[PDB]
Amino acid sequence: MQEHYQPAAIEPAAQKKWDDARISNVSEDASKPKYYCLSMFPYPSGKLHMGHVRNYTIGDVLSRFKLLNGFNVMQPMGWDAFGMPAENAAMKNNVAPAAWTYDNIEYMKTQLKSLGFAVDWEREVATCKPEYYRWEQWLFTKLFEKGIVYRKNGTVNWDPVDQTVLANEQVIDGRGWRSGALIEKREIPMYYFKITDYAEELLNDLDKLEHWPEQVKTMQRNWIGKSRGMTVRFAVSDDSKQGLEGDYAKFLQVYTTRPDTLMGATYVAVAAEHPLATAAAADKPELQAFIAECKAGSVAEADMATMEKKGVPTGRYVVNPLNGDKLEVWIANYVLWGYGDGAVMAVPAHDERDFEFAAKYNLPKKQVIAVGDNAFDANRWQEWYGDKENGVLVNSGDLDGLDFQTAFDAVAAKLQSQGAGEPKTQYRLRDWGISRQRYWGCPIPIVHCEKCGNVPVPADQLPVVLPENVVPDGMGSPLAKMPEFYETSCPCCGGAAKRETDTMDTFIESSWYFFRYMSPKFSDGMVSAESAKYWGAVDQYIGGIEHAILHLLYARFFTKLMRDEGLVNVDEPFERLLTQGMVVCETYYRENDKGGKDWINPADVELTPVSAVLKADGLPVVISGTEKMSKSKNNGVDPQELINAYGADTARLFMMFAAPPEQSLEWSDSGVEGAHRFLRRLWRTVYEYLKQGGAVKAFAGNQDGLSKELKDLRHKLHSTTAKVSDDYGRRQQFNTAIAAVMELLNQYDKTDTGSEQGRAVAQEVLEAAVRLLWPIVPHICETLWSELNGAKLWEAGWPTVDEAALVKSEIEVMVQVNGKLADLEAAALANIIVVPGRLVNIVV
């Protein structure tokens, strides 16, 4: 055994020992209990970043821990290969997106294997291969004939200079983010998942997830946005029916979730596309411009509530069906056409958004709810204005005194008796649009025939192979400029027909890949029925918070779709969900000659502790703020150079010890040094132990007769084993478990283990400490364990807790004052010469 810890020699050898033993290549074996630990598969973007290392080390600690406890552990790995980054690099470096992708995969695979992750590489998938996306094209055709997938005209943003579609997040003040040209709203036919048909199922099944973060379940409930309200119809006054047709000339219909406050409606609001808005804007140019500004907007829903609410009066009036008040109709920019009826009622006294709107335009406010004896200020909003559980109605005629639920049913009675309203349930959830005007994506298995219509590709002709021999230029999606691809024959009549040139949303690949890992080479379906029954569902899911809404909801939607098709037997894909925090770093720059800043990568800097300067230039730079690692402010720390400088075990240990997994991790140069020096200490601790006698049989059994010092070390040992096991399986806080093993080595250093019984307790401490640290630093623990014990580490198993070593030794004693029944005198005074051991006597 070498005296000094050199990871470059022990990490490759330990990896071959694991690959030769094939301990990570697991099977559907009904002998050992299964465990499915899954980390979110990455985009093959070129190199791994620190966010990748943290996410996949967390998954590996959980996997190696469950494996050491006797589980059949599947930790698969794959690549989310479809996406825009491949097209952008294709335009930049003049290469094919497929070629650019496959070289990033084979390089990032070498980085992952160097870190020593226990990954079953015989289950590796790649979403850009036809052997994978053929099955989401297959599920597309099935759900398309059922109507779950349907084709419908939709509105998108078209950049007339970059010649492509842009999402709302890529539009800035009406212009494209790159071209800077005004975008055009276009109505094009697209495809949709009918996810609204599963809204009640996706909402209620969140209650089954007793091991999900409560905030993730909360965010999904708000996104679905179920609401039980009331449809209300306000009759249009006779002086306002000009230019209206159909039922719009008879009434204005709205939806509200608080019909108990219908007596407090001071005005109504309609969307810019509403017929009442169109009839009012016929001769007033101020309304025409307001409608045009609303249509030209591109507010993303992540910022929809943060936009300034604006409105214009129409001069038209409707009648409240309960008190007969004439309410003026306004055109509001926050009312979205297609969300319900496209028209709402406003109660400024009990809705904060209506309060700020009325305060802006000096609109009336009518209090109709009261909570206790609280004062109602018409010029200041209070939190109790919108309370529902502890309020009673006021200023509502024959509705005064009713609470929320009784007034709700009372209002429904009057509305239904008049035929002016009825209860209705609504959902904020929209359908899922999957059409993408991109090249590097899964083709949509639709063929357009002038006689048969939109025809799905039959199952025999799947997949519709995307040609990998394309280099996009940037002047339109290449699939539309390639007749050799879209010119085809109709699979129904054989006539001339064209293929769909739009590709699928890349979220479709990530929505079911966790099932494909169970049988990645299965060629007769999405997932083999035998492997789906064995693995069931993912036991542990690890990923970032940015996928808590869209990706997680899509994965649950696909799981219920595949369940209703007969492929799987679970309602939910993920049992446990761990949300890893981001990784941040310090930013550096220099001042530009034009009044700006040019950012510098931290690796190209060196600090004096005081100021900082370049590594080779000696030009003093300026240190800036700390934020998430990104190429924006050029603060990304390459983990490969970290592996080159310290090895894989130091990188894994630093990220597991710097902060808890949910908390953000700040990069620290001195932090990775403390991780490396601790691994040097652990190596020296085992070396110096074997240097004075060698290995012995670790202590086991009855500990009676051991010294007080050695008994205290065994107590600390089995306390650490119980503390680490609870930190891995339950708390999932890996930084606290590292310090627990560190404190065990502290007491070991302070304990004389030179005796014959001392050597045995020392062996028991070290054999457990290397197994307690194996999930975090498997390379050095594998090497050190083979020096202490000759058995295979994974067959020795997770350290067992000896509960006898935790029980303290008691000394029963009798206490008689004056004959009748230093620490013993203290307890016998909490009840004077004492005979040592059995008698204490209180000199009365």
Ligand X SMILES: CC(C)C[C@H](N)C(=O)NS(=O)(=O)OC[C@H]1OC[C@@H](CCCn2cc(CN)nn2)[C@H](O)[C@@H]1O
Query: What residue ranges bind Zn ion (CB under 5 A)?
Result: 449, 451-452, 490, 492-493, 495
Least gap, CB of 748 to ligand X (angstroms): 36
**Distances in whole angstroms, Cα of residue 420 to Cα of each of 248, 320, 406, 589:** 14, 10, 19, 66
Regarding 512 and contact with ligand X (CB under 6 A), the answer is no
Q: Which is nearer to Zn ion, 457 or 508 (CB)?
A: 457
* 430 lies in the binding site for ligand X (CB under 6 A): no
Q: Which of 219, 582, 698, 722 binds ligand X (CB under 6 A)?
A: 582
182 or 582: CB nearest ligand X: 582
Name the nearest CA neighbour of 640 among 205, 2, 23, 50: 50
User: Shortest distance, CB of residue 688 to ligand X, whole angstroms?
Assistant: 39
Q: Tell the smallest beta-carbon distance from residue 543 to ligand X (Å).
A: 4
What does 510 interact with, of Zn ion, ligand X, none (CB < 5 to 8 A by kind)?
ligand X
- The one of Zn ion, ligand X, none whose footprint includes residue 493, by CB under 5 to 8 A per kind, is Zn ion
Query: Which of 47, 175, 551, 590 forms a contact with ligand X (CB under 6 A)?
Result: 551
Nearer to Zn ion, 211 or 451 (CB): 451
Closer of 491 and 544 to Zn ion (Cβ)? 491
Q: Which residue in the block uniquely carries the two structure tokens 């509001």?
A: 332
Least separation in angstroms between residue 453's CB and Zn ion is: 8
Residue number of the CB atom closest to ligand X:
544
Residue 302 or 475: the one with the smaller Cβ distance to ligand X is: 302
Q: Pick one of ligand X, Zn ion, none as the site partner of residue 451 (Cβ within 5 to 8 A by kind).
A: Zn ion
Asked if 547 touches ligand X (CB under 6 A), the answer is yes
CA atoms within 13 A on the CB side of 484: 5
Cβ atoms of residues 351 and 258 within 8 Å: yes
Other beta carbons within 10 angstroms of residue 251's beta carbon come to 16
Interatomic CA distance for residues 403 and 420, integer angstroms: 22
- Interface with ligand X, residue 331, by CB under 6 A: no
Q: Does 15 bind ligand X (CB under 6 A)?
A: no
SS3 for 282? Answer: coil
| Segment lying near ligand X (by CB under 6 A), choices 38-46, 97-105, 533-541, 795-803 | 38-46
Q: How far is the CB of 458 from Zn ion (least distance, A)?
A: 13
- Judged by beta carbon distances under 5 to 8 A according to partner kind, the member of ligand X, Zn ion, none in contact with residue 235 is none
The CA-based dihedral angle spanning residues 347, 350, 353, 359, taken in that order and rounded to the nearest 10 degrees: 70
Return the number of the residue (128 or 183) whose C-beta is nearest ligand X: 128
Distance, CA of 522 to CA of 527 (rounded, Å): 7
**492 touches, from Zn ion, ligand X, none (C-beta below 5 to 8 Å by class):** Zn ion
Question: Which CB sits closer to Zn ion, 493 or 603?
Answer: 493
718 binds, among ligand X, Zn ion, none (CB under 5 to 8 A by kind): none
617-627 b/e (C-beta count within 10 Å ≥ 16 → b)? eeeebeeeeee
- What's the min distance (Å) between Cβ of 108 and Zn ion? 44
| CA distance linking residue 429 with residue 222, whole number of Å | 9
Q: How far is CA 48 from CA 53, 108, 180, 548, 645, in A?
A: 7, 6, 32, 22, 16
Cβ proximity of 606 and 613 under 8 Å:
yes
The Cα 761–Cα 696 span in angstroms is 10
Q: Which does 79 bind (CB under 5 to 8 A by kind): Zn ion, ligand X, none?
A: none
DSSP string across 397-457: GGGTT--HHHHHHHHHHHHHHHTSEEEEEEESPPPEE-EE--SSSPBP-EEEETTTEEEEP
Query: Would you tell me the crossing angle of helices 7-21 and 778-788 to the nearest 10 degrees?
Result: 80
Q: How far is the CB of 50 from ligand X (least distance, A)?
A: 5
Tokens of 408: 């709700």
**What are the tokens at 80?**
């989310």
40 binding ligand X? (CB under 6 A) = yes
CA distance 605 to 612: 7
583 binds ligand X (CB under 6 A): yes
Smallest separation, CB 83 to ligand X (Å): 8
- Reduced 3-state DSSP string for 181-234: CECEEEEEEEEEECHHHHHHHHHHHHHHCCCCCHHHHHHHHHHHCEEEEEEEEE
User: Taking the complex as a whole, how short is the minimal distance between the CB of residue 601 and ligand X, in angstroms?
Assistant: 13
Binding mask 740-769 for ligand X (x = CB under 6 A): ------------------------------
Beta carbon nearer to Zn ion, 391 or 445: 445
List 275, 543, 758, 799, residue binding ligand X (CB under 6 A): 543
Report the residue number, 85 or 154, with the smaller CB distance to ligand X: 85
Give the β-pairing of 574-580 and 538-544: parallel
Closest CB to ligand X among 487 and 546?
546
Give the residue, chosen from 544, 660, 671, 674, that forms a contact with ligand X under the rule CB under 6 A: 544
Q: Which residues share a beta bridge with 274?
A: none
**Segment (H or E) for 710:** helix 708-726
- Rounded CA-CA distance 354/359 in Å is 8
Both structure tokens of 674 = 């403390």
Task: Let me know: does 260 contact 282? Beta carbons within 8 Å.
Answer: no
Identify which of residues 525 and 544 has a Cβ nearer to ligand X in the complex. 544
Per rule CB under 6 A, count of chain residues that contact ligand X: 20
Residue 510 Cβ vs ligand X, minimum distance, rounded to whole Å = 4
451 or 731: CB nearest Zn ion: 451
Closer residue to ligand X (CB): 411 or 527? 527
**Between 612 and 631, how does the x/- string for binding to ligand X read (CB under 6 A)?**
----------------xx--
For the CB of residue 102, give the shortest distance to Zn ion in the complex, in Å.
36
577 makes contact, choosing from Zn ion, ligand X, none, with CB < 5 to 8 Å by partner type, with none
393 binds, among Zn ion, ligand X, none (CB under 5 to 8 A by kind): none
Closer residue to ligand X (CB): 42 or 445: 42
Check if the beta carbon of residue 419 is closer than 8 Å to that of residue 412.
Answer: no
Single out the residue of 5, 35, 36, 41 in contact with ligand X (rule: CB under 6 A).
41
In terms of CB distance, is 493 or 645 closer to Zn ion?
493
Tokens of residue 222, six digits? 């708000």
Closest CA to 347 of 270, 260, 428, 406: 260
Give dist(CA 196, CA 430) in Å, integer.
7
Task: Give alpha helix (H) positions in 69-189.
Answer: 84-93, 97-114, 130-145
Contact window for ligand X (CB under 6 A) among 65-73, 254-262, 540-548, 726-734: 540-548
Q: Measured from the CB of residue 334, what is the shortest distance to ligand X in angstroms? A: 31
Residue 547's binding partner among Zn ion, ligand X, none (Cβ under 5 to 8 angstroms by kind) is ligand X
**Closest approach of ligand X to the CB of residue 582, in Å:** 3
For the bound state, the minimum distance from the C-beta of residue 481 to Zn ion, rounded and expressed in Å, comes to: 24
Dist. CA 490–CA 498, nearest whole Å = 8
510 binds ligand X (CB under 6 A): yes
Between residues 316 and 547, which has the closer beta carbon with respect to ligand X?
547
Q: Give dist(CA 75, CA 276) in Å, integer.
A: 58
In whole angstroms, give the CA distance from residue 25 to residue 6.
28
Smallest gap from Cβ 145 to Zn ion, in A, equals 16
List binders of ligand X among 44-103 (CB under 6 A). 49-52, 55, 80
Which residues contact ligand X by CB under 6 A?
Answer: 40-43, 49-52, 55, 80, 510, 543-544, 546-547, 551, 582-583, 628-629
